[PDB]
C-alpha cells in the first residue's frame, strides 16, 4: 500500500548514511530535541539543562540569517584551507560523523565569520531601505 | 578636640571595605530609536 | 607592561631539520570572537617586516606548510619544518589582542 | 596599490621636535577600514609601536610608554600621515615604518609596510 | 597585520559611544545574554531567571515584525510629542544611556503601538493573498 | 473620544465569539502566555513548566513555514474527510471551542502533514537556488 | 466631514414613548470602525451616557441604569441613528448628543459631537 | 456604580496662576494594552463638549501645554498651567476603561 515503515526511519535513523540522504530527513532529529524531594531536583536540573542548550543552539542560529529555516545558504566563501575536499564527494562519499572530525578545528572561525557576514548584510539592507 | 574611638558593631562594615567598588546593573536590551526607513511591502 | 620573551637567542639550523622558535606572553591570548591574536613576522636585515602566520594553526594566503603555528594560552611556538636558503632572517612574535602592541626581542637564524 | 613613502630630517638636534611625514601614493589616506600607524625599530633591537589611527572614528592611539610627547595628525591637504615628537632623545634612534592595516578582510587580507626612514639624533652635520 | 584588538571591543564595549557607532556592533551584547544542596537552588533560580527574561525579550520582539532580524524598520510614524529632537543629532550627538532617560515615559505606548501595527499588517497580507 | 474600553477586550475576551471576530485580536491571548524552602520548589516547577510548554508550541510552529508570523497560509489541501463543512459558515457560524471538538481526531495527521510539506518546500527552494 | 443633525419632539407627553433621530450628513452611518452613541446631559448637572453601537459587529450597548426601556436601532433607509425610549420621566429632561467615536486612530483621532437637541417633557403645548 | 467625584466645586482663578482640577474614580484605570483610560473634556455653556486630554501625560494634536494630565491609580488631576480668557467653562472627568462610561459632576471656572 501507500505508507510503509521501511523508508520512514526514526531518531538518529540515517546516522551512518551519506549526507545526501541524511539531509533528506532532518526534522526527525529536530523535533525530538526538547520534549523527548531530591530526585525531583534531579528532574529540575535535567529539564533546565535541556531547555537551556536548546535555546543556545537557537540563538547561534538566530543571529545568522537563519531564524527557523533549518537549511539556508549564506554569503561567506569556502576557503579551501578548512577542508580542501572536493564538492562532488562530500554529499555521497562521506558521512556526517566522518565530517565532524574533519572540521572540528575550524569551527569558531566559521561561527565568528557568520555573525559578521549577517550584521554587514543587516545594516546594508537598512541603507538600501533608508535612501528610498 | 574630636576624640575618635574604635568600634566594631555590625559585621557588615567589614565587607563594605571590599564591596565598595562594585555595583550590579541589569542589562536591558531592545531599545528604540527613530530613523528614516520603512518596512516595504 | 606585558613581556614578550623569545627562546632561543640564535639558532644555526641545518636545511631540512625541523626548527622551532618559541615566544611567551604575560597572559592568554584567546578572544571571545573566536580568533587567537598571536602573530609571527619575518624580517630580513635592511628590509621591512612581513607577516607570516596570522590566526595560528591556519596558514596565510601565500605561505606554504614550511611555517606552522601551535600552542595554547601564554605559550606560543613557531615551527619551521623545512629550511631553505631564504629561511634566514630575524623572526618576531607580536600580540594583537590588547593595546599596546608589543613585539619580541628578535630571533636571528643564520646559515652554517 | 597604495605605496607609502616616508620623509623627515636625518639629523635631528637634541631637545628639539622631530617631524616626520608619510606620503600616501596610489591612494588616499581617508580610505575606510584601514589602520594608519607609525612603527619604530632600533637596528637589531626589536620593533616598537609608536601609535596608530583608525580612519572611521578618527581615533588616535599611542604607546603607553610614549603618550606624553607624540601627537599624530592627518594631512588631507597633501595626502600625508604626520608624526610630531618633541624633546627627542637617544633611545629614539630607529627606522620609522608607516603601516596601513586593514581591520577587516573585506578591506584587505595583507597589510602594507613602508620602506622605512632611519632617523638618528646628532648635532653633527 | 590584519586583525587587531583595537576596534574589536568586548561586552558593553561602546557603552559611552554614540548611537551611530554602537549600532555598528550590536551582536557582542547579543550573544553574551544567555550563556555568559541549597546553593544548587541558588544556581537553579539564577538560571531559570536568565532563560525567562531572555524569552520575554524574544517574545516582545517576536510579535512585532522582527523575528530574529535584530535591526528592522516598522510602519508607525514618529510623533514629535515623544522626543521632539532632530534626527541629524541623535545618531552622532547623544549616547544610548542618555537616550534611555529621554524616552522612558513613552515606552508601553510604543510597545502597544507596534503590536497593532503588525497585526493590521498581518491580516492585510492574508487578504491580499486570499483574493489571489 | 478616541480610545474606549468597549471593543478593547482582555484575556480570553472573544472566547465565545465567532472565528471571524476572534482572529481579529489574537495577540491578547499571545502575550499573556509566558509572563502572566519547599514552596520555592512549587515556584520552580511552575515556572519551568510554563517556559517548557511555550517552547514546545514555538517549536511545532517553527518547523512549519511560520517562524513568528502568527497567521500563515500553507500548501496542504483540505481533505473533506477531516471536517466536511462549508467554508462560508465556519468563519461566522461556529466558534473556536465548537471547532476544537469538531477536529480533535484529525490533529497529528495535520501536524504530520505540515512538516513534510515544509521540508519538501525547503530543499526545493535550495534546488532552485543551487542551479542559479 | 460628517455633520450630525438631531431631531425629535421638543414636548413629550408623560407615560408615552420618545423617538429621536440623528441625521448623518456628509457621510454614511455604515462607515467602519466608528462608535455611534447617544449622550444626554441635564443643564448644569453633568453628562450621562445613554447607549452606544459599534458598526463592525452590530453590538448595541446601553447604560446599566437604563437597559430596560432604551432600544437603539440603525435606519439605513434614511441614513439616521435612532433612539426609542418608552415611559419617559422627569429625570430624562436633557440635551441629546449624537456622538460618532473612532475606535482606532486609523479611523480618526478626534471624534465629532452633535449640536444637541434639548428635550423637555411636559403636557403644555 | 463607580463614582466620579470632582474637587473643588468652583474655582475663581487669576490669569497666570496654575490651576488644578482633580477627579477620583472608584478603582485604578490602567489597562494591559498600555494606555491609561482617563480623559478630560471642556464644555462651554450652550456648547457641545470637546475632548482636551486623552492618554494623560500626553497632549493631543491641537492643545498646547496650558493643560496637563498627571496622577496614578484612582487619583487623577487636571492641571491648568496658564489661564486665558477662553479658559472659563465646565470641565468633566470621564473613564473609558470599563462599560458604562461615567462622567464627573462638573467643575465650573469663571472670571474674576
Ligand atoms: C568621548 O568623548 C570624545 C570627545 O568628543 C569623543 O571623541 C570624538 O569621537 C568621534 C567618533 O570617533 C570623532 O568623530 C570626534 O572627532 C571625536 N572628538 C574628539 C574631540 O576627540 C569620543 O568618541 C567619546 N567616546 C569614547 C568612547 O571615547
Ligand atoms: C452570542 O449570541 C448573539 C446572538 O446571535 C451574537 O450576536 C450576533 O453577533 C454578530 C456579530 O457581532 C452580529 O452580526 C449579529 O447580528 C448578532 N445577532 C444578534 C441576534 O444579536 C453574539 O455575537 C454571540 N457572542 C457574544 C460574545 O455575545
Ligand atoms: C586539529 O589541530 C591539531 C593540532 O592543533 C592537529 O593535530 C589535528 O590534525 C587537526 N585536525 C585536523 C582534522 O587536521
Ligand atoms: C516623565 O514624566 C514625569 C511625570 O509624569 C516627568 O516629571 C518627567 O519629566 C517625564 N520625563 C521626561 C524625560 O520628560
Ligand atoms: C473521533 O473518533 C471516535 C472513535 O475513534 C468517534 O467516536 C468520534 O465521533 C470521532 N470524533 C468526531 C468529531 O467525529
mmCIF file with all atom_site columns, N, CA, C and O in Angstrom, chain A residues 89-124:
data_model
loop_
_atom_site.group_PDB
_atom_site.id
_atom_site.type_symbol
_atom_site.label_atom_id
_atom_site.label_alt_id
_atom_site.label_comp_id
_atom_site.label_asym_id
_atom_site.label_entity_id
_atom_site.label_seq_id
_atom_site.pdbx_PDB_ins_code
_atom_site.Cartn_x
_atom_site.Cartn_y
_atom_site.Cartn_z
_atom_site.occupancy
_atom_site.B_iso_or_equiv
_atom_site.pdbx_formal_charge
_atom_site.auth_seq_id
_atom_site.auth_comp_id
_atom_site.auth_asym_id
_atom_site.auth_atom_id
_atom_site.pdbx_PDB_model_num
ATOM 1   N N  . UNK A 1 89  ? 32.272 14.760 -3.817 1.00 0.00 ? 89  UNK A N  1
ATOM 2   C CA . UNK A 1 89  ? 32.342 13.606 -2.936 1.00 0.00 ? 89  UNK A CA 1
ATOM 3   C C  . UNK A 1 89  ? 31.517 13.781 -1.663 1.00 0.00 ? 89  UNK A C  1
ATOM 4   O O  . UNK A 1 89  ? 30.766 12.876 -1.294 1.00 0.00 ? 89  UNK A O  1
ATOM 5   N N  . UNK A 1 90  ? 31.533 14.954 -1.033 1.00 0.00 ? 90  UNK A N  1
ATOM 6   C CA . UNK A 1 90  ? 31.132 15.066 0.367  1.00 0.00 ? 90  UNK A CA 1
ATOM 7   C C  . UNK A 1 90  ? 29.621 15.156 0.533  1.00 0.00 ? 90  UNK A C  1
ATOM 8   O O  . UNK A 1 90  ? 29.130 15.507 1.609  1.00 0.00 ? 90  UNK A O  1
ATOM 9   N N  . UNK A 1 91  ? 28.873 14.873 -0.524 1.00 0.00 ? 91  UNK A N  1
ATOM 10  C CA . UNK A 1 91  ? 27.448 14.646 -0.392 1.00 0.00 ? 91  UNK A CA 1
ATOM 11  C C  . UNK A 1 91  ? 27.046 13.212 -0.697 1.00 0.00 ? 91  UNK A C  1
ATOM 12  O O  . UNK A 1 91  ? 25.885 12.856 -0.480 1.00 0.00 ? 91  UNK A O  1
ATOM 13  N N  . UNK A 1 92  ? 27.963 12.384 -1.195 1.00 0.00 ? 92  UNK A N  1
ATOM 14  C CA . UNK A 1 92  ? 27.676 10.969 -1.372 1.00 0.00 ? 92  UNK A CA 1
ATOM 15  C C  . UNK A 1 92  ? 28.831 10.041 -1.020 1.00 0.00 ? 92  UNK A C  1
ATOM 16  O O  . UNK A 1 92  ? 28.651 8.820  -1.094 1.00 0.00 ? 92  UNK A O  1
ATOM 17  N N  . UNK A 1 93  ? 30.003 10.556 -0.651 1.00 0.00 ? 93  UNK A N  1
ATOM 18  C CA . UNK A 1 93  ? 31.101 9.695  -0.214 1.00 0.00 ? 93  UNK A CA 1
ATOM 19  C C  . UNK A 1 93  ? 31.133 9.565  1.306  1.00 0.00 ? 93  UNK A C  1
ATOM 20  O O  . UNK A 1 93  ? 31.011 8.462  1.844  1.00 0.00 ? 93  UNK A O  1
ATOM 21  N N  . UNK A 1 94  ? 31.278 10.686 2.006  1.00 0.00 ? 94  UNK A N  1
ATOM 22  C CA . UNK A 1 94  ? 31.460 10.657 3.446  1.00 0.00 ? 94  UNK A CA 1
ATOM 23  C C  . UNK A 1 94  ? 30.123 10.489 4.158  1.00 0.00 ? 94  UNK A C  1
ATOM 24  O O  . UNK A 1 94  ? 29.061 10.371 3.545  1.00 0.00 ? 94  UNK A O  1
ATOM 25  N N  . UNK A 1 95  ? 30.185 10.472 5.482  1.00 0.00 ? 95  UNK A N  1
ATOM 26  C CA . UNK A 1 95  ? 29.014 10.519 6.333  1.00 0.00 ? 95  UNK A CA 1
ATOM 27  C C  . UNK A 1 95  ? 29.249 11.609 7.366  1.00 0.00 ? 95  UNK A C  1
ATOM 28  O O  . UNK A 1 95  ? 30.354 12.145 7.481  1.00 0.00 ? 95  UNK A O  1
ATOM 29  N N  . UNK A 1 96  ? 28.194 11.934 8.118  1.00 0.00 ? 96  UNK A N  1
ATOM 30  C CA . UNK A 1 96  ? 28.205 13.150 8.924  1.00 0.00 ? 96  UNK A CA 1
ATOM 31  C C  . UNK A 1 96  ? 29.165 13.047 10.098 1.00 0.00 ? 96  UNK A C  1
ATOM 32  O O  . UNK A 1 96  ? 29.829 14.029 10.447 1.00 0.00 ? 96  UNK A O  1
ATOM 33  N N  . UNK A 1 97  ? 29.261 11.869 10.716 1.00 0.00 ? 97  UNK A N  1
ATOM 34  C CA . UNK A 1 97  ? 30.210 11.693 11.809 1.00 0.00 ? 97  UNK A CA 1
ATOM 35  C C  . UNK A 1 97  ? 31.646 11.723 11.311 1.00 0.00 ? 97  UNK A C  1
ATOM 36  O O  . UNK A 1 97  ? 32.543 12.161 12.038 1.00 0.00 ? 97  UNK A O  1
ATOM 37  N N  . UNK A 1 98  ? 31.884 11.265 10.083 1.00 0.00 ? 98  UNK A N  1
ATOM 38  C CA . UNK A 1 98  ? 33.206 11.415 9.494  1.00 0.00 ? 98  UNK A CA 1
ATOM 39  C C  . UNK A 1 98  ? 33.490 12.863 9.138  1.00 0.00 ? 98  UNK A C  1
ATOM 40  O O  . UNK A 1 98  ? 34.653 13.266 9.059  1.00 0.00 ? 98  UNK A O  1
ATOM 41  N N  . UNK A 1 99  ? 32.444 13.662 8.922  1.00 0.00 ? 99  UNK A N  1
ATOM 42  C CA . UNK A 1 99  ? 32.653 15.077 8.643  1.00 0.00 ? 99  UNK A CA 1
ATOM 43  C C  . UNK A 1 99  ? 33.001 15.845 9.904  1.00 0.00 ? 99  UNK A C  1
ATOM 44  O O  . UNK A 1 99  ? 33.837 16.753 9.869  1.00 0.00 ? 99  UNK A O  1
ATOM 45  N N  . UNK A 1 100 ? 32.356 15.500 11.021 1.00 0.00 ? 100 UNK A N  1
ATOM 46  C CA . UNK A 1 100 ? 32.501 16.273 12.250 1.00 0.00 ? 100 UNK A CA 1
ATOM 47  C C  . UNK A 1 100 ? 33.907 16.172 12.824 1.00 0.00 ? 100 UNK A C  1
ATOM 48  O O  . UNK A 1 100 ? 34.362 17.094 13.507 1.00 0.00 ? 100 UNK A O  1
ATOM 49  N N  . UNK A 1 101 ? 34.607 15.073 12.553 1.00 0.00 ? 101 UNK A N  1
ATOM 50  C CA . UNK A 1 101 ? 36.019 15.004 12.902 1.00 0.00 ? 101 UNK A CA 1
ATOM 51  C C  . UNK A 1 101 ? 36.851 15.840 11.943 1.00 0.00 ? 101 UNK A C  1
ATOM 52  O O  . UNK A 1 101 ? 37.868 16.427 12.331 1.00 0.00 ? 101 UNK A O  1
ATOM 53  N N  . UNK A 1 102 ? 36.426 15.916 10.683 1.00 0.00 ? 102 UNK A N  1
ATOM 54  C CA . UNK A 1 102 ? 37.241 16.532 9.647  1.00 0.00 ? 102 UNK A CA 1
ATOM 55  C C  . UNK A 1 102 ? 37.229 18.051 9.685  1.00 0.00 ? 102 UNK A C  1
ATOM 56  O O  . UNK A 1 102 ? 37.955 18.671 8.904  1.00 0.00 ? 102 UNK A O  1
ATOM 57  N N  . UNK A 1 103 ? 36.433 18.669 10.551 1.00 0.00 ? 103 UNK A N  1
ATOM 58  C CA . UNK A 1 103 ? 36.247 20.114 10.508 1.00 0.00 ? 103 UNK A CA 1
ATOM 59  C C  . UNK A 1 103 ? 36.362 20.761 11.882 1.00 0.00 ? 103 UNK A C  1
ATOM 60  O O  . UNK A 1 103 ? 36.489 21.996 11.958 1.00 0.00 ? 103 UNK A O  1
ATOM 61  N N  . UNK A 1 104 ? 36.399 19.970 12.961 1.00 0.00 ? 104 UNK A N  1
ATOM 62  C CA . UNK A 1 104 ? 36.198 20.445 14.330 1.00 0.00 ? 104 UNK A CA 1
ATOM 63  C C  . UNK A 1 104 ? 37.239 21.449 14.809 1.00 0.00 ? 104 UNK A C  1
ATOM 64  O O  . UNK A 1 104 ? 36.985 22.141 15.799 1.00 0.00 ? 104 UNK A O  1
ATOM 65  N N  . UNK A 1 105 ? 38.390 21.550 14.148 1.00 0.00 ? 105 UNK A N  1
ATOM 66  C CA . UNK A 1 105 ? 39.309 22.635 14.457 1.00 0.00 ? 105 UNK A CA 1
ATOM 67  C C  . UNK A 1 105 ? 38.789 23.977 13.968 1.00 0.00 ? 105 UNK A C  1
ATOM 68  O O  . UNK A 1 105 ? 39.055 25.005 14.593 1.00 0.00 ? 105 UNK A O  1
ATOM 69  N N  . UNK A 1 106 ? 38.052 23.981 12.866 1.00 0.00 ? 106 UNK A N  1
ATOM 70  C CA . UNK A 1 106 ? 37.763 25.196 12.126 1.00 0.00 ? 106 UNK A CA 1
ATOM 71  C C  . UNK A 1 106 ? 36.427 25.817 12.490 1.00 0.00 ? 106 UNK A C  1
ATOM 72  O O  . UNK A 1 106 ? 36.121 26.917 12.019 1.00 0.00 ? 106 UNK A O  1
ATOM 73  N N  . UNK A 1 107 ? 35.627 25.157 13.319 1.00 0.00 ? 107 UNK A N  1
ATOM 74  C CA . UNK A 1 107 ? 34.527 25.850 13.959 1.00 0.00 ? 107 UNK A CA 1
ATOM 75  C C  . UNK A 1 107 ? 35.079 26.843 14.973 1.00 0.00 ? 107 UNK A C  1
ATOM 76  O O  . UNK A 1 107 ? 36.221 26.732 15.425 1.00 0.00 ? 107 UNK A O  1
ATOM 77  N N  . UNK A 1 108 ? 34.247 27.837 15.303 1.00 0.00 ? 108 UNK A N  1
ATOM 78  C CA . UNK A 1 108 ? 34.518 29.102 15.996 1.00 0.00 ? 108 UNK A CA 1
ATOM 79  C C  . UNK A 1 108 ? 35.358 30.063 15.163 1.00 0.00 ? 108 UNK A C  1
ATOM 80  O O  . UNK A 1 108 ? 35.595 31.191 15.600 1.00 0.00 ? 108 UNK A O  1
ATOM 81  N N  . UNK A 1 109 ? 35.821 29.655 13.988 1.00 0.00 ? 109 UNK A N  1
ATOM 82  C CA . UNK A 1 109 ? 36.200 30.575 12.934 1.00 0.00 ? 109 UNK A CA 1
ATOM 83  C C  . UNK A 1 109 ? 35.046 30.789 11.968 1.00 0.00 ? 109 UNK A C  1
ATOM 84  O O  . UNK A 1 109 ? 34.785 31.914 11.540 1.00 0.00 ? 109 UNK A O  1
ATOM 85  N N  . UNK A 1 110 ? 34.333 29.709 11.650 1.00 0.00 ? 110 UNK A N  1
ATOM 86  C CA . UNK A 1 110 ? 33.140 29.813 10.820 1.00 0.00 ? 110 UNK A CA 1
ATOM 87  C C  . UNK A 1 110 ? 32.020 30.493 11.589 1.00 0.00 ? 110 UNK A C  1
ATOM 88  O O  . UNK A 1 110 ? 31.316 31.354 11.049 1.00 0.00 ? 110 UNK A O  1
ATOM 89  N N  . UNK A 1 111 ? 31.863 30.157 12.872 1.00 0.00 ? 111 UNK A N  1
ATOM 90  C CA . UNK A 1 111 ? 30.803 30.758 13.672 1.00 0.00 ? 111 UNK A CA 1
ATOM 91  C C  . UNK A 1 111 ? 31.070 32.237 13.916 1.00 0.00 ? 111 UNK A C  1
ATOM 92  O O  . UNK A 1 111 ? 30.134 33.027 14.058 1.00 0.00 ? 111 UNK A O  1
ATOM 93  N N  . UNK A 1 112 ? 32.342 32.630 13.958 1.00 0.00 ? 112 UNK A N  1
ATOM 94  C CA . UNK A 1 112 ? 32.661 34.043 14.023 1.00 0.00 ? 112 UNK A CA 1
ATOM 95  C C  . UNK A 1 112 ? 32.525 34.730 12.683 1.00 0.00 ? 112 UNK A C  1
ATOM 96  O O  . UNK A 1 112 ? 32.241 35.930 12.622 1.00 0.00 ? 112 UNK A O  1
ATOM 97  N N  . UNK A 1 113 ? 32.728 33.991 11.593 1.00 0.00 ? 113 UNK A N  1
ATOM 98  C CA . UNK A 1 113 ? 32.585 34.579 10.269 1.00 0.00 ? 113 UNK A CA 1
ATOM 99  C C  . UNK A 1 113 ? 31.122 34.796 9.919  1.00 0.00 ? 113 UNK A C  1
ATOM 100 O O  . UNK A 1 113 ? 30.789 35.714 9.161  1.00 0.00 ? 113 UNK A O  1
ATOM 101 N N  . UNK A 1 114 ? 30.236 33.959 10.457 1.00 0.00 ? 114 UNK A N  1
ATOM 102 C CA . UNK A 1 114 ? 28.836 34.019 10.055 1.00 0.00 ? 114 UNK A CA 1
ATOM 103 C C  . UNK A 1 114 ? 28.128 35.217 10.667 1.00 0.00 ? 114 UNK A C  1
ATOM 104 O O  . UNK A 1 114 ? 27.234 35.795 10.042 1.00 0.00 ? 114 UNK A O  1
ATOM 105 N N  . UNK A 1 115 ? 28.512 35.605 11.886 1.00 0.00 ? 115 UNK A N  1
ATOM 106 C CA . UNK A 1 115 ? 27.848 36.725 12.549 1.00 0.00 ? 115 UNK A CA 1
ATOM 107 C C  . UNK A 1 115 ? 28.180 38.044 11.870 1.00 0.00 ? 115 UNK A C  1
ATOM 108 O O  . UNK A 1 115 ? 27.300 38.893 11.686 1.00 0.00 ? 115 UNK A O  1
ATOM 109 N N  . UNK A 1 116 ? 29.442 38.234 11.490 1.00 0.00 ? 116 UNK A N  1
ATOM 110 C CA . UNK A 1 116 ? 29.829 39.470 10.825 1.00 0.00 ? 116 UNK A CA 1
ATOM 111 C C  . UNK A 1 116 ? 29.279 39.530 9.409  1.00 0.00 ? 116 UNK A C  1
ATOM 112 O O  . UNK A 1 116 ? 28.994 40.617 8.897  1.00 0.00 ? 116 UNK A O  1
ATOM 113 N N  . UNK A 1 117 ? 29.100 38.376 8.767  1.00 0.00 ? 117 UNK A N  1
ATOM 114 C CA . UNK A 1 117 ? 28.538 38.369 7.422  1.00 0.00 ? 117 UNK A CA 1
ATOM 115 C C  . UNK A 1 117 ? 27.035 38.584 7.448  1.00 0.00 ? 117 UNK A C  1
ATOM 116 O O  . UNK A 1 117 ? 26.424 38.857 6.410  1.00 0.00 ? 117 UNK A O  1
ATOM 117 N N  . UNK A 1 118 ? 26.414 38.434 8.615  1.00 0.00 ? 118 UNK A N  1
ATOM 118 C CA . UNK A 1 118 ? 24.998 38.756 8.733  1.00 0.00 ? 118 UNK A CA 1
ATOM 119 C C  . UNK A 1 118 ? 24.796 40.218 9.096  1.00 0.00 ? 118 UNK A C  1
ATOM 120 O O  . UNK A 1 118 ? 23.965 40.905 8.488  1.00 0.00 ? 118 UNK A O  1
ATOM 121 N N  . UNK A 1 119 ? 25.557 40.715 10.072 1.00 0.00 ? 119 UNK A N  1
ATOM 122 C CA . UNK A 1 119 ? 25.369 42.087 10.532 1.00 0.00 ? 119 UNK A CA 1
ATOM 123 C C  . UNK A 1 119 ? 25.828 43.097 9.494  1.00 0.00 ? 119 UNK A C  1
ATOM 124 O O  . UNK A 1 119 ? 25.321 44.219 9.462  1.00 0.00 ? 119 UNK A O  1
ATOM 125 N N  . UNK A 1 120 ? 26.786 42.724 8.644  1.00 0.00 ? 120 UNK A N  1
ATOM 126 C CA . UNK A 1 120 ? 27.102 43.564 7.496  1.00 0.00 ? 120 UNK A CA 1
ATOM 127 C C  . UNK A 1 120 ? 25.960 43.547 6.493  1.00 0.00 ? 120 UNK A C  1
ATOM 128 O O  . UNK A 1 120 ? 25.622 44.579 5.907  1.00 0.00 ? 120 UNK A O  1
ATOM 129 N N  . UNK A 1 121 ? 25.332 42.387 6.314  1.00 0.00 ? 121 UNK A N  1
ATOM 130 C CA . UNK A 1 121 ? 24.190 42.288 5.416  1.00 0.00 ? 121 UNK A CA 1
ATOM 131 C C  . UNK A 1 121 ? 22.948 42.917 6.027  1.00 0.00 ? 121 UNK A C  1
ATOM 132 O O  . UNK A 1 121 ? 22.017 43.283 5.303  1.00 0.00 ? 121 UNK A O  1
ATOM 133 N N  . UNK A 1 122 ? 22.920 43.063 7.348  1.00 0.00 ? 122 UNK A N  1
ATOM 134 C CA . UNK A 1 122 ? 21.725 43.579 8.006  1.00 0.00 ? 122 UNK A CA 1
ATOM 135 C C  . UNK A 1 122 ? 21.616 45.093 7.858  1.00 0.00 ? 122 UNK A C  1
ATOM 136 O O  . UNK A 1 122 ? 20.561 45.612 7.480  1.00 0.00 ? 122 UNK A O  1
ATOM 137 N N  . UNK A 1 123 ? 22.692 45.818 8.165  1.00 0.00 ? 123 UNK A N  1
ATOM 138 C CA . UNK A 1 123 ? 22.651 47.272 8.054  1.00 0.00 ? 123 UNK A CA 1
ATOM 139 C C  . UNK A 1 123 ? 22.689 47.730 6.603  1.00 0.00 ? 123 UNK A C  1
ATOM 140 O O  . UNK A 1 123 ? 22.181 48.808 6.285  1.00 0.00 ? 123 UNK A O  1
ATOM 141 N N  . UNK A 1 124 ? 23.277 46.927 5.709  1.00 0.00 ? 124 UNK A N  1
ATOM 142 C CA . UNK A 1 124 ? 23.278 47.274 4.290  1.00 0.00 ? 124 UNK A CA 1
ATOM 143 C C  . UNK A 1 124 ? 21.890 47.119 3.691  1.00 0.00 ? 124 UNK A C  1
ATOM 144 O O  . UNK A 1 124 ? 21.563 47.767 2.691  1.00 0.00 ? 124 UNK A O  1
#
